[PDB]
Write a protein that binds this ligand. Sequence first.
Ligand code: HEM
Ligand code: HEM
Ligand SMILES: Cc1cc(N)nc(C[C@@H]2CNC[C@@H]2OCCCCCc2cccc(N)n2)c1
Ligand SMILES: Cc1cc(N)nc(C[C@@H]2CNC[C@@H]2OCCCCCc2cccc(N)n2)c1
Ligand SMILES: C[C@H](O)[C@H](O)[C@H]1CNc2nc(N)[nH]c(=O)c2N1
Ligand SMILES: C[C@H](O)[C@H](O)[C@H]1CNc2nc(N)[nH]c(=O)c2N1
Ligand SMILES: [Zn+2]
Lengths: 407, 411
Amino acid sequence: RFLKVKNWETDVVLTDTLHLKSTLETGCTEHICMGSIMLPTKDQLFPLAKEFLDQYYSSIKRFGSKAHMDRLEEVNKEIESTSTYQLKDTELIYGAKHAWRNASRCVGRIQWSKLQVFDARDCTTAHGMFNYICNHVKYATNKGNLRSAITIFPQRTDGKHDFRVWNSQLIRYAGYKQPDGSTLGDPANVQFTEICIQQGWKAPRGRFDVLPLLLQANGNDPELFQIPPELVLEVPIRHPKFDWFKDLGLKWYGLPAVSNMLLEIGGLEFSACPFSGWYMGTEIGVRDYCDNSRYNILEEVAKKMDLDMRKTSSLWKDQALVEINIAVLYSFQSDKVTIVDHHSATESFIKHMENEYRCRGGCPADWVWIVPPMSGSITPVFHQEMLNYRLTPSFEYQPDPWNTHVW
Amino acid sequence: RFLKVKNWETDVVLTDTLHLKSTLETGCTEHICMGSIMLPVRTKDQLFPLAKEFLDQYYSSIKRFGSKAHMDRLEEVNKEIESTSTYQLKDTELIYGAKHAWRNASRCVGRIQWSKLQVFDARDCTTAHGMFNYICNHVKYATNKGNLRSAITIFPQRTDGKHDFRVWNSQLIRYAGYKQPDGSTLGDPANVQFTEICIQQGWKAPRGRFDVLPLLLQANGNDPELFQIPPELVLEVPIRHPKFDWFKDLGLKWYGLPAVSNMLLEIGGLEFSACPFSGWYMGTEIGVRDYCDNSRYNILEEVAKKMDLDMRKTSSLWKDQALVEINIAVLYSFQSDKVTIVDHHSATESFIKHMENEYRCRGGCPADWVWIVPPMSGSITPVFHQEMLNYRLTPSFEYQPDPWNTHVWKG
Ligand code: HEM
Ligand code: HEM
Ligand SMILES: Cc1cc(N)nc(C[C@@H]2CNC[C@@H]2OCCCCCc2cccc(N)n2)c1
Ligand SMILES: Cc1cc(N)nc(C[C@@H]2CNC[C@@H]2OCCCCCc2cccc(N)n2)c1
Ligand SMILES: C[C@H](O)[C@H](O)[C@H]1CNc2nc(N)[nH]c(=O)c2N1
Ligand SMILES: C[C@H](O)[C@H](O)[C@H]1CNc2nc(N)[nH]c(=O)c2N1
Ligand SMILES: [Zn+2]
């Protein structure tokens, strides 16, 4: 009931107390650790509301004041009456910033308090959703000078009227099974691409086709919309030394924007809440390009470098991985699109951890997601012990809507 | 109960029943995961249960469960415990035990090899000098002129915890670290504290960047004694690079034999506080950690300087670049000298095959993801994408505190 984390590179020891305020369940027991698993009424709602408003009023230094006891009473009466309640704009902004603050898998949280929140709770149609989302994309992109933002559609009511963005991210590339047997474009999105085509989409059947948004308002069947191309900022990938790199024909998008998550604030569930920041280089160059199940480009790059691909021990995979990531970084920087490298991002996260320990009593962190997918041990997060626990407000993963929705 | 693990690259789903045989604690709760925390005298009362579990397991493994030989051995151990407070393992049980501790070691990526382990029974040992002889024979057997063979040497078990055998070195072979008055370190920073104990015990330090440390050995709870491993027994590899001819002039070398000596082996309730074991290196242990940790030899800058990498900002990935070249060098050098080494691609691939086999035949394989994933190039190895269940099985290896913090000095 008082826990220590040690950094093994610097010997700095931090003391966590924030974990006692933790509420949801981790997946682990005394007997089994699930640290590496990807997915481990009225009466229910008032405690959840209360817990939230208590933290909110404490943050603005008005815990136990009349404005506190009055809001607690107002919310209580509204739940009693309507079976739900509405958040004040101030509460909504706070909840959103804190769900990011609490996101244990996010390395970029030094940035948590600079989050532009777009209140789309007044939305009612898929066309409305499209308008809001285009406005979010343009605001956040900001001609390459990226700004963090979230747009929050209306909360869950009876659960049969959910707003959902069916895309997993606002901007992604299509994937198509080929006669060949192989895959064209991004294999992650084969299924979704089919759902779009089975719902009307005219696919260009290219390697890098920006998918249509597929939007669900008020539990209705979802509809298709193309994001204005002038709003989707893309980056052709070149290398600062390798002439031939450009000829691979690689590009990626500047805006990472997760839109399949569920934002939970004071017991309320916001099932459509796309949010966006900016990239860490490795997300694109290590994962998007190199994962066997993704664009899987290592072989082709290794060939152009003329490495010895005969034996794994020549580290040809590793050598090519580094250059691919140098090129991702160099291209974003040259075209002036915000990107951070894993050295700088993990160094920032250590600074943020220390702020959160002295200021808040801790910082939940999932080491398995926080340490970059390349060069783990030469980044400082490798040597930092972390405690992982679930705080609310939070972002939660939710099932793909096609698996659920009735048509 | 059944727990499933998915591999997100292949969609292969495995079912773990083995976790049901797990007994000890993880450190985690339903409220906190301590998966990245590095560290998350027995009565009769406790002992016979631990013995019984163990012998039930051993007897099952030989398909003799419930045999007269099994029941007679249970009775015998019961009696030995009731009358003497402890018991002695048969050779066959010791061997099986040491094999299964390695098999159960969830942080070890090398476990495909668990059944081929040479066990040296050193339970007749009585003196530090005896321990020294035993360790020499182990080093020479394991080294085998570069054709490394896994081995373990097992000294007498704990009795009252006042009479422990301990190897004070954390590994049998390691380099001296020396703190300089100006605050720099010469040689290996990890070993500064232990080097200082050695010096105080009378070791004459050469004060070089790569001095092999003397063994400091404790028998029967006595004060530790110093011994120099014969140099002809310490196989070393000079580090050079296939294309970069200046690599050799950095003056690096490493020892071929990774040999962990500070861990405690538990078999059937008995505690073997000195049980050095050895295998062979995966290249990244040396090339990533030993050379490139900031708290170790820290050679990234010097390498990148020689390579003329752009070092003015991190986003040139100069560190990532230098790190790969060094790792290339370590594997090249070992291979050229015919010293057994495995790369992290081949090791993780073998591990996944081992792991799947273990689910089919054993009903699980406990694995610590934080340690199994290599410290470079994580996601281009198949373990990154592998969900893993971590739990504790016995027989087992455990961390124990360094003996210089606990030892009662006799004078
Ligand atoms: C501003 C720059 C940001 C950086 C550099 C960054 C970095 C990252 C990275 C590298 C990951 C792991 C992604 C992966 O490997 O798939 C991640 C995950 C995550 N981040 Fe951030 N992030 C940023 C902004 C944001 C914002 C604005 C939010 C929410 C407001 C957020 C919340 C999350 C969540 C919930 C996850 C886990 C996603 C999942 O479970 O699939 N992050 N972050
Ligand atoms: C045969 C070749 C072997 C290879 C390639 C191998 C590989 C490794 C590696 C890379 C680690 C992580 C160590 C680190 O990064 O510091 C490790 C840990 C470990 N291995 Fe192995 N291993 C081998 C043999 C053995 C043997 C023979 C045993 C005992 C019989 C053993 C038991 C352990 C234990 C207990 C750990 C955790 C050590 C700790 O917590 O400090 N391994 N293995
Ligand atoms: C099964 C599953 C669970 C879960 N919690 N998340 C996922 C999505 C997978 C996990 N890793 C890659 C993929 O998600 C991509 C998420 C987008 C990246 C997150 C992000 C958000 C904001 C900024 C930024 N730089 N990066 C999948
Ligand atoms: C605090 C602590 C706990 C714990 N369980 N282990 C340690 C020792 C740390 C862990 N990683 C670096 C350092 O020890 C070196 C590990 C020894 C190598 C393991 C090994 C054995 C046999 C063969 C091989 N290739 N590798 C430290
Ligand atoms: C099985 C394992 O949990 C899975 O591969 C995780 C590992 N760490 C990760 N880390 C990040 N940042 N993103 C991921 O998608 C994953 N995948
Ligand atoms: C804090 C963290 O658990 C610690 O630095 C671990 C991470 N993973 C590791 N993995 C291996 N193989 N060896 C190690 O020493 C470590 N150190
Ligand atoms: Zn856990």
